[model samples]
Target: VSRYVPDMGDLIWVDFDPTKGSAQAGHRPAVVLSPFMYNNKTGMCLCVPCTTQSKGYPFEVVLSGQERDGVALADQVKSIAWRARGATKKGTVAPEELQLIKAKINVLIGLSH
Candidate 1:
């Protein structure tokens, strides 16, 4: 299966709430959650939990717009994964934090999913 990788500044489809309105408009531009191989051929992304405490939410590697296609997608995913891994090692982010980030991005991108 082909693997997908993400990169910086690339647009990604993130799950979040839009009902909060302006209260959720400043958390965009989130980093990927991990650095793992995504089997694009099988359509699966993988990751390791960043925190020791269970977050109750499944971890996901943010899929960038470039990664929505071929070749570039794989590369972008890889880059994002690497960045995420680094961020985790430095204790810079968490899974729950993603909710806020996604909400912010959704606002900028609009709520039309």
Candidate 2:
């Protein structure tokens, strides 16, 4: 795929480092968690990592039929820069799955109605 700016709900692969703290631990698939065009303002995109590990749960959204089988981990979100060296904007997520992810994010952040 051609290089493109990541949009909200888009799945991107980023080379993340573990020392930064509580995101994911390394190179992995990550879901864009910020709004559309948000990267343009700050030159950084917010994302949550996707993993093959994790037994799975409300925070983990399963992604099938792509480069591989993976789970988007919602609880571990982080902002990655476009220039700090990382991220390949992979693709977007399904609408139903996006909605579910938003739902889980809301509940997890204690913002649900």
Candidate 3:
């Protein structure tokens, strides 16, 4: 077996945005941290700002659309179409964090296949 390790390509949802930062254009993006199997469902991933010891929370995985040839799966799967509020280092949501979160979302959204 593959041992079922979670990868960046897995899908996830945004459980909480403690920072409350506003995303660009007032839209917030979804965040994906790490991947994990939930009750044999096997389709959940964690978000960033997650602790190394914690897998964080799981959100619904939605397919945005298909990608062009040679494109990694991660880039193909869009976590949140809407922009996401950012989070602060203190675990709080701030306007700046919201912007940061948006940028991070784009990065995580394009991580691996």
Top-lDDT candidate index: 2
Task: Give the distance in Å from residue 32's predicted Cα in candidate 3 to where it truly belongs.
Answer: 10
As a TM-score, model 2 comes out at 0.75
RMSD of 3: 16.3
lDDT of 3 by residue, 56-105 (tens): 22322222234311111222233331123222121223344334444444
- Runs in model 2 deviating more than 4 A are 1-3, 16-26
Model 1 TM-score, all chains together: 0.26
Would you list the clashing residue pairs of candidate 2?
none
Q: What is the descending TM-score order?
A: 2, 1, 3
Candidate 1: misplaced stretches above 4 Å?
Answer: 1-30, 33-88, 111-113
Identify the candidate with maximal TM-score.
2
- Per-model TM-score, in order, reads 0.26, 0.75, 0.20
lDDT of each: 0.31, 0.72, 0.31
In model 3, what lDDT does residue 27 have? 26
What does the lDDT read for residue 59 in candidate 1?
32
Residues 72-110 of candidate 2 have per-residue lDDT tens digits of 787777778853565555578888777777677787888
Model 3 gets an lDDT of: 0.31
lDDT of 1 by residue, 6-97 (tens): 32222332223455443234322234433334422223333222222232332333332332311111112222333233221211333444
